[PDB]
Amino acid sequence: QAEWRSWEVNKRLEYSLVKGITEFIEQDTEEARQQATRPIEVIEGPLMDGMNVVGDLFGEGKMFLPQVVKSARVMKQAVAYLEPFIEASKEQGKTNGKMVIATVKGDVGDIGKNIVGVVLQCNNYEIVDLGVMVPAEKILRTAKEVNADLIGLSGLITPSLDEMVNVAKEMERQGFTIPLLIGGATTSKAHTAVKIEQNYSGPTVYVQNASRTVGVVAALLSDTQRDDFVARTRKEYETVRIQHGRKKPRTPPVTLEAARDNDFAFDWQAYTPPVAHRLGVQEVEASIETLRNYIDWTPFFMTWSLAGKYPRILEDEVVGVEAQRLFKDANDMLDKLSAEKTLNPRGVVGLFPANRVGDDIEIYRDETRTHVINVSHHLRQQTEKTGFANYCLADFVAPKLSGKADYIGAFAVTGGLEEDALADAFEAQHDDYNKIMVKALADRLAEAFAEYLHERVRKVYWGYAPNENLSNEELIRENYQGIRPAPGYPACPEHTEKATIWELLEVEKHTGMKLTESFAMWPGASVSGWYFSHPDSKYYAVAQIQRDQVEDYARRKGMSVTEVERWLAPNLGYDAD
Ligand code: B12
């Protein structure tokens, strides 16, 4: 009764490590301890060798992320046993290097940084994760104290880009010398070479994914390829730098007043917006069982680095089988979470009477539309357009002057407040696998709540599409009437606008959701936005706007021209200043 459970205790570890088995991992690492001269030996011995096998099958394309991080669980759960033994010992082993990783200040994204983290650990590297929303002061202070070999920053939203710039400028002022690694959603080879590097004398390198990271950190910590690398990189960032400064034959921008004039052309007198069936703010609720169906799995696989749209991905050649397994692993947790009620999604919805006024939407106390209680600000496209209107989300709402009764909604949902706790429980058991899963699922559940809610709105709450019966795939295709733009996307860049959503719906109190200094939401698995009904509305990108609109927007927002320039950095069609 065994078979594999009968080879050399070292052939067992190295094996269980690859296959990712954890039910003999305790006694297998123990027996290999008593049989070793000193604790640390089991590390560079069976464990080390085993991991290499993973890195190998990884490159050939046999193993994928899911397994790698699943093997990491073994690697870690093993060491976790060798803590006292490896500690109460003499020389306690070496590493390929130590790195301080952190999600920049004001940002809450971390799954990606987690992936990059574990991967680097599966390559015998020390990683001190400083978590999220970490000030550059802490990052550096820590890099100093722990004497890290390099610093790595991660970001998801726009505010983050500037924050990384800060850290660069800081490391430069504090006379740092180690290389600065930058990554995450918003980070791009472009921005990392036109708005960051020129701030730090040390080597600043951008990296697209966890995989390539090991490559970069390799040379960067190599007494050989280091110079050659940085040199090629510096000269490489210079090229992309001048290329993003050739000012190609673009279309001449237009004045703010010129744009507004070419606003959405629509006969409002002949049109009568659908009246809101249920005005006011309500707290909505849906179980995991209710939202699963509304989950869009394609993104989920992307989080585990398995390309291919779902479900076509399941029958894929190269990564089909693993995709199948991950999905199954995923759903089993959802079944658990749904049963035990350990993760409960929450949300608040609200419909209000409104009307358009310029590039803004006026929210009123009641239907008498005599008292403005809030104002949704929006920007407008400022490129010379012909035959097409200079799009603005506000245009899709009947203007005060048209005397037409129009409306606007707002929402805020989450996969559950417990997201953070559930993950911590895993970190505690050195289970990064399930830790990454719960967060990935929390997110899939948040977005699902979003889809579900928007439906319940069109159908019930706002009730303009009662006879709507679209399929999950059609929902993914957005094949319904009306949009639900969310502050952050190109349709509405201004992030600080989520404040108005919090104020209006009283998010904090109905869901427990909050906003941070950088206007980030917590829990991370969170979605908030508006609800337009107009059948001609779309997610038109604001694009590059000019100085005149910034000043004007600044006046309506009651913010400093400098402030809005920070928040709308990515859309500054003029000299960023
Ligand atoms: C999952 C996701 C979410 C989640 C939560 C994320 C979280 N908080 O963990 C949900 C659905 C809940 C969500 C919400 C929001 N989202 Co969102 N989201 C995504 C999405 C669909 C997928 C990509 C993804 O995030 N990948 C998994 C991650 C975390 O991996 P990664 O970051 O890409 O990491 C890889 C590398 O970059 C690298 N890496 C990571 N860090 C580091 C560090 C170092 C040092 C190194 C070398 C490498 C490295 O390794 C990874 C490879 O393994 C994208 C679309 C897209 N395709 O870009 C938008 C996107 C990132 N989201 C966006 C925005 C607009 C929002 C919201 C503001 C919307 C709202 N509701 O109001 C909020 C976020 C605020 C909040 N919650 O606090 C934008 C950002 C635009 C911007 N503003 O600059 C995007 C690009 C969408 C768009 N088209 O505009 N989102």
From Swiss-Prot:
<protein>
    <recommendedName>
        <fullName>Methionine synthase</fullName>
    </recommendedName>
</protein>
<comment type="function">
    <text>Catalyzes the transfer of a methyl group from methyl-cobalamin to homocysteine, yielding enzyme-bound cob(I)alamin and methionine. Subsequently, remethylates the cofactor using methyltetrahydrofolate.</text>
</comment>
<feature type="binding site">
    <location>
        <position position="210"/>
    </location>
    <ligand>
        <name>methylcob(III)alamin</name>
    </ligand>
</feature>
<feature type="binding site">
    <location>
        <position position="158"/>
    </location>
    <ligand>
        <name>methylcob(III)alamin</name>
    </ligand>
</feature>
<feature type="domain" description="AdoMet activation">
    <location>
        <begin position="247"/>
        <end position="577"/>
    </location>
</feature>
<feature type="domain" description="B12-binding N-terminal">
    <location>
        <begin position="1"/>
        <end position="94"/>
    </location>
</feature>
<feature type="binding site">
    <location>
        <position position="296"/>
    </location>
    <ligand>
        <name>S-adenosyl-L-methionine</name>
    </ligand>
</feature>
<feature type="binding site">
    <location>
        <begin position="106"/>
        <end position="110"/>
    </location>
    <ligand>
        <name>methylcob(III)alamin</name>
    </ligand>
</feature>
<feature type="binding site">
    <location>
        <position position="484"/>
    </location>
    <ligand>
        <name>S-adenosyl-L-methionine</name>
    </ligand>
</feature>
<feature type="binding site" description="axial binding residue">
    <location>
        <position position="109"/>
    </location>
    <ligand>
        <name>methylcob(III)alamin</name>
    </ligand>
</feature>
<feature type="domain" description="B12-binding">
    <location>
        <begin position="96"/>
        <end position="231"/>
    </location>
</feature>
<feature type="binding site">
    <location>
        <begin position="539"/>
        <end position="540"/>
    </location>
    <ligand>
        <name>S-adenosyl-L-methionine</name>
    </ligand>
</feature>
<comment type="similarity">
    <text>Belongs to the vitamin-B12 dependent methionine synthase family.</text>
</comment>
<feature type="binding site">
    <location>
        <position position="154"/>
    </location>
    <ligand>
        <name>methylcob(III)alamin</name>
    </ligand>
</feature>
<feature type="binding site">
    <location>
        <position position="44"/>
    </location>
    <ligand>
        <name>methylcob(III)alamin</name>
    </ligand>
</feature>
